[PDB]
Design an enzyme around this catalytic site. Sequence first.
Site, PDB file in Angstrom:
ATOM      1  N   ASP A  52      72.274   4.278  20.178  1.00  0.00           N
ATOM      2  CA  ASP A  52      71.938   5.438  20.996  1.00  0.00           C
ATOM      3  C   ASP A  52      70.742   5.130  21.897  1.00  0.00           C
ATOM      4  O   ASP A  52      69.687   5.760  21.759  1.00  0.00           O
ATOM      5  CB  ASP A  52      71.647   6.650  20.108  1.00  0.00           C
ATOM      6  CG  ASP A  52      72.728   6.880  19.066  1.00  0.00           C
ATOM      7  OD1 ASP A  52      73.920   6.921  19.438  1.00  0.00           O
ATOM      8  OD2 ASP A  52      72.385   7.010  17.869  1.00  0.00           O
ATOM      9  N   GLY A  82      76.899  14.170  10.349  1.00  0.00           N
ATOM     10  CA  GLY A  82      78.005  15.080  10.130  1.00  0.00           C
ATOM     11  C   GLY A  82      77.567  16.499   9.833  1.00  0.00           C
ATOM     12  O   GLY A  82      78.384  17.345   9.462  1.00  0.00           O
ATOM     13  N   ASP A 101      65.454  10.104  24.277  1.00  0.00           N
ATOM     14  CA  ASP A 101      65.563  10.079  25.731  1.00  0.00           C
ATOM     15  C   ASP A 101      64.167   9.942  26.317  1.00  0.00           C
ATOM     16  O   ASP A 101      63.283  10.747  26.014  1.00  0.00           O
ATOM     17  CB  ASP A 101      66.249  11.334  26.273  1.00  0.00           C
ATOM     18  CG  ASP A 101      66.372  11.314  27.783  1.00  0.00           C
ATOM     19  OD1 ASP A 101      66.942  10.340  28.317  1.00  0.00           O
ATOM     20  OD2 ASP A 101      65.898  12.266  28.438  1.00  0.00           O
ATOM     21  N   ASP A 147      73.248   5.787  28.967  1.00  0.00           N
ATOM     22  CA  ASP A 147      72.244   6.466  29.769  1.00  0.00           C
ATOM     23  C   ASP A 147      72.076   5.673  31.055  1.00  0.00           C
ATOM     24  O   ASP A 147      72.298   4.460  31.079  1.00  0.00           O
ATOM     25  CB  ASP A 147      70.908   6.600  29.028  1.00  0.00           C
ATOM     26  CG  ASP A 147      70.063   7.749  29.550  1.00  0.00           C
ATOM     27  OD1 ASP A 147      70.424   8.331  30.594  1.00  0.00           O
ATOM     28  OD2 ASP A 147      69.046   8.078  28.910  1.00  0.00           O
ATOM     29  N   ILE A 151      71.387  17.712  18.949  1.00  0.00           N
ATOM     30  CA  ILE A 151      71.083  16.287  18.979  1.00  0.00           C
ATOM     31  C   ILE A 151      71.500  15.739  20.340  1.00  0.00           C
ATOM     32  O   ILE A 151      72.046  16.457  21.184  1.00  0.00           O
ATOM     33  CB  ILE A 151      71.779  15.497  17.848  1.00  0.00           C
ATOM     34  CG1 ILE A 151      73.301  15.547  18.001  1.00  0.00           C
ATOM     35  CG2 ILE A 151      71.349  15.995  16.473  1.00  0.00           C
ATOM     36  CD1 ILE A 151      74.024  14.579  17.087  1.00  0.00           C
ATOM     37  N   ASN A 178      75.370  21.545  18.296  1.00  0.00           N
ATOM     38  CA  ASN A 178      74.537  20.648  17.504  1.00  0.00           C
ATOM     39  C   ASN A 178      73.390  20.164  18.375  1.00  0.00           C
ATOM     40  O   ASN A 178      73.617  19.554  19.425  1.00  0.00           O
ATOM     41  CB  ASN A 178      75.348  19.466  16.963  1.00  0.00           C
ATOM     42  CG  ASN A 178      74.625  18.727  15.858  1.00  0.00           C
ATOM     43  OD1 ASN A 178      73.740  19.279  15.207  1.00  0.00           O
ATOM     44  ND2 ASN A 178      74.999  17.472  15.638  1.00  0.00           N
ATOM     45  N   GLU A 215      79.937  13.741  22.912  1.00  0.00           N
ATOM     46  CA  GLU A 215      78.515  13.805  22.598  1.00  0.00           C
ATOM     47  C   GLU A 215      77.769  12.905  23.577  1.00  0.00           C
ATOM     48  O   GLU A 215      78.355  12.370  24.524  1.00  0.00           O
ATOM     49  CB  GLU A 215      78.257  13.407  21.139  1.00  0.00           C
ATOM     50  CG  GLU A 215      78.660  11.979  20.792  1.00  0.00           C
ATOM     51  CD  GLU A 215      78.551  11.679  19.306  1.00  0.00           C
ATOM     52  OE1 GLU A 215      78.135  12.574  18.542  1.00  0.00           O
ATOM     53  OE2 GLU A 215      78.884  10.544  18.901  1.00  0.00           O
ATOM     54  N   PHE A 262      79.944  17.371  19.304  1.00  0.00           N
ATOM     55  CA  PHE A 262      81.044  18.076  18.651  1.00  0.00           C
ATOM     56  C   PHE A 262      80.830  19.583  18.684  1.00  0.00           C
ATOM     57  O   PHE A 262      79.997  20.078  19.452  1.00  0.00           O
ATOM     58  CB  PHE A 262      81.226  17.582  17.212  1.00  0.00           C
ATOM     59  CG  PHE A 262      81.687  16.157  17.120  1.00  0.00           C
ATOM     60  CD1 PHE A 262      83.035  15.858  17.011  1.00  0.00           C
ATOM     61  CD2 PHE A 262      80.776  15.114  17.154  1.00  0.00           C
ATOM     62  CE1 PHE A 262      83.466  14.550  16.930  1.00  0.00           C
ATOM     63  CE2 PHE A 262      81.200  13.802  17.074  1.00  0.00           C
ATOM     64  CZ  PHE A 262      82.548  13.519  16.964  1.00  0.00           C
TER      65      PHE A 262
HETATM   66 CA   LIG Z   1      70.933  10.236  25.524  1.00  0.00          CA
HETATM   67 CA   LIG Z   2      68.280  10.008  30.327  1.00  0.00          CA
END
Ligand SMILES: [Ca+2]
Ligand SMILES: [Ca+2]
Length: 290
Positions: free
Chosen positions: A12, A91, A73, A253, A128, A126, A181, A147
């Site tokens: 991520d 989850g 981020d 990203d 996140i 969610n 997501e 999700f």
């Molecule tokens: Ca991101």
């Molecule tokens: Ca960004």
Amino acid sequence: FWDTKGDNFIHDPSIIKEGNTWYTFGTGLGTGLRVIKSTDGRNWSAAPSIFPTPLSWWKMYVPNHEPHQWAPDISYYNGRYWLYYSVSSFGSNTSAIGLASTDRISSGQWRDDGLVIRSTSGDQFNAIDPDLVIDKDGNPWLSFGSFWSGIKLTRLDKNTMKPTGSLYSIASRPNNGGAVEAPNITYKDGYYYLFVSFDSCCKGVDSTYKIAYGRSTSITGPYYDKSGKNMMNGGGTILDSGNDRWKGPGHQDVLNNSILVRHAYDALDNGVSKLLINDLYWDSQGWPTY
Ligand SMILES: [Ca+2]
Ligand SMILES: [Ca+2]
């Protein structure tokens, strides 16, 4: 792409670049948030992790939170670096997006800016995978979601860098389990481009992870495909579905409308997620291509 070597493990990721030094913020390895640095963009090395000890108020909104935090981020805006991050369990829906800030990443000193937005079991989203985006007029927005109902978008006020107004649904996937997501939005030549990640992420070599994008003349407006399919009905033109070596690319990203970073699962190394960086281009119609 950019062949990444060395300590190029990430998950991520979100890319930033202060001076000549690249910084990739990622889901923490062990505790907190993972950071790796690079002088040339190809050789990466470990960097001090963010939040080595868990913040106290995390236990308030996500008591069962995993020791490592997810999907950071990083961006510079209004004279300061902003670091949005997630606090959640896998989850699970009990999630919370926090905010860290600093004037200079190389100082390693981050200020605790508090809760951004929370999601409980009663909510249909969610909290996140956050992502900051600045209007064509210069005002901040935050897109998030994973999700459930899908991708949510809210306007931030320049003062608190926290949500105001109402939540806007910009991408959903009802006929495919909401498998969307990791959103990130960018403006270029009149259009806002929402990138997202499709399908399942944590299955390693066998994970079905894709990268899909859409455009809209309005930041909250209907995002469409090259086919004209609204991203709220599962619309998404696939930018990357993987090759024989890198499987299940996702949680992408974009930086400066010229660099798309991304984690992919190395089929030649038992499926551990590595860092993949590409120079992002745009075709004759302004759509993102490699
Ligand atoms: Ca991101
Ligand atoms: Ca960004």
